[PDB]
Design a protein that fits this description.
This is part of a larger assembly, with two copies of chain A, four copies of chain C and two copies of chain G. Chain A is an all-beta fold. Chain A has no helices and seven strands. In chain A, a hairpin with a 4-residue loop joins β6 and β7. The radius of gyration of chain C is 19 Å and the shape is rod-shaped. By secondary structure, chain G is an alpha+beta fold. In chain G, the strands form four sheets. Chain G has a five-stranded mixed beta sheet, with no helix packed on it. In chain G, strands 10-12-13-15-14 form a five-stranded antiparallel beta sheet, with helices on one face. In chain G, strands 2-8-7-4 form a four-stranded mixed beta sheet, with no helix packed on it. The N and C termini of chain G lie far apart (98 Å). The chains are: A mainly beta, C mainly alpha, G alpha+beta. At the G-H interface, β1 of G face loops of H. β1 of chain C pairs antiparallel with β4 of chain G. It is classed as translocase.
Amino acid sequence: RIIYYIQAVIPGRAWLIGSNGSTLTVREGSKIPGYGMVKLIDSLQGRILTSSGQVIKFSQEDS
Amino acid sequence: RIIYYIQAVIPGRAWLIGSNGSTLTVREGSKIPGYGMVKLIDSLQGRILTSSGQVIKFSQEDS
Amino acid sequence: QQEIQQRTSDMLTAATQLVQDWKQVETQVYTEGT
Amino acid sequence: QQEIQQRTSDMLTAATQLVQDWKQVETQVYTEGT
Amino acid sequence: QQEIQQRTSDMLTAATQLVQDWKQVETQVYTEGT
Amino acid sequence: QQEIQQRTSDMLTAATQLVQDWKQVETQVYTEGT
Amino acid sequence: EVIDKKAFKDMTRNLYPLNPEQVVKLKQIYETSEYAKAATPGTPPKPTATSQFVNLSPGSTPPVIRLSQGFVSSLVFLDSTGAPWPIAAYDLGDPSSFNIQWDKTSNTLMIQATKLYNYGNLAVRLRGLNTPVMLTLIPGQKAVDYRVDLRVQGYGPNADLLLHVLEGVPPPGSRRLVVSGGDARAWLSNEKMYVRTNLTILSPGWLASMTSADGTHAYEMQKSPVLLVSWHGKVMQLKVEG
Amino acid sequence: QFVNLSPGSTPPVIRLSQGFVSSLVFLDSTGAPWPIAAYDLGDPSSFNIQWD
């Protein structure tokens, strides 16, 4: 399916890139396709919590 | 039907855009077609209260 | 009781600052191109 | 009790420093090439 | 007991020295050749 | 007992001298020939 | 002899009052303080690029520009055809809140807001027009406009969509279609399909076609529920939804 | 990155660090270089820019 990776994160926003190359930016309450509703943006440690229980991170060899 | 979105808001006024591309500006007591009578303009949090109970907001991917 | 007057002095300075900030209106600038 | 006032003085200096740091906004620079 | 304050003075000088050393960032230099 | 402090003063001068001697690093020199 | 060691330890403690771990924690405190100082309250605005049409009727409303303190917005002006329209002059009210950079010949302005919540207005006169174009400038919203493209009603001194399909930009007014069986994209605008692919279409028959320099094809055709495609000598079929 | 000049896409992001140098080079869709006519930098107290 599609996998999203953190490109940049500040307090408040997060810029994500997908495996198709599309880029998005999100805030605390926002819609993400295929993942659900954003519950918490943690600027430290690079973790994004999602309503489906998933955590959005950096690519492992690109981080 | 037609959906209206907040383009800009200050205390007192609000500039709205429709799905047809038409742009309007409103104050506290004003007429909106298809929604009714404006009851309260809340400049913080980007919410507009309408006499029909509806709340006018920003577009979700454009906000 | 005396707190009204100390409050009057910090408040006096802040309100004078606010009104002098509300006084200034600056002239517009027109730019000509060729 | 007097600790509130010593704390007021170090805190006053730090908060004045913070607000004066928040005041400055600098003009942008445009570079022309030929 | 008073040792806390003597320690505060040597420590104050060292920490001020450390933070002023952490403040400076210098501009890069570009060299052109022909 | 007081010998610790006299020793502290000659030692302080010598250690300051040593650390200031350890601080200096000088730029290299390039010589061009024709 | 213990005098030498005792003098040596008080001397070392006088020379270096801070431990290495204290240096590490002090550095951590300093960087955390800088991060808290530099962090921004609330959420930052969403950066967007837009495109609007400006109507010069005596009934229409002037357009709105969303700004932010310290950021740069570039304004570019085009006519009804889409060609650039050079600027004759401009006028900025309240320069203590805004700073405008402009080379004296192009059709792009770069505006930066200086204050947080003070709003204003701006007048722009173009080269061929007599009616000036008026903009209003409001900072401090939930979105920040990096670029607004403005279509002006008249015609400038300079005067297709399948080219945009070739570049990957969806055609304007279209809707997405679902394609199965191969690497292709398609859109439907006016009961016509627009297809972007690098395969070769053989059977259903097209009306017009475009090609890029590196071999990308864009086709415009009528609607059909089947396509027959052969890739570099091999014949197969692709199946579409709707 | 591939840069799309559509009015819907998001502008690209450059990740930096204090004291380090990042070089940006501009090329076209084919891959040939595209020379820069001008630039405009907001906040020069945070960034330092060199350009021949």
